[PDB]
Design brief:
alpha/beta, 4-stranded parallel beta sheet, 19% strand, binds iron/sulfur cluster, monomer, 8 strands, two-stranded antiparallel sheet
Length: 150
Amino acid sequence: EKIIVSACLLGQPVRYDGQSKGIVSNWLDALGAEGRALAFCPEVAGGLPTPRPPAERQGEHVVTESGLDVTAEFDRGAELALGLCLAQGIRFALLKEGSPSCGSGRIYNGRFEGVSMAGEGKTTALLRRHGIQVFSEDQLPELALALSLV
Ligand code: SF4
Ligand SMILES: [Cl-]
Ligand SMILES: [Cl-]
């Protein structure tokens, strides 16, 4: 049984600033070693480059600070994450917290002022809407338990 994981959490240099968000986790390393952790970046899958400007949700829209509307790429990325889960039989996702794509408990408030609020990214919202459970990197014990139970 496999999971989909934000590519940056696996150390891939796909974040908007070219860096990674690699986490230290013996459990996640073991899952990857078994071919069970499928790396996926919704923004790169959706056609955005690396690096790319910071973006925030404004309701259903996703925009950069200059007003460029990148919702099309964000939605494509979300739909491709769902497509990957349906094709592979995946029911769990481990996604990066705070992201306008991968956030699950919090996101930036759309005002470009470093202020977070309760909410979720576009990919997380679509996956949850289709019965896929999404956990952040702050919820590894719950994800590991959910995965082992089935
Ligand atoms: S879109 Fe998600 S997986 Fe891709 S770099 Fe941003 S937080 Fe990581
Ligand atoms: Cl950052
Ligand atoms: Cl963050």
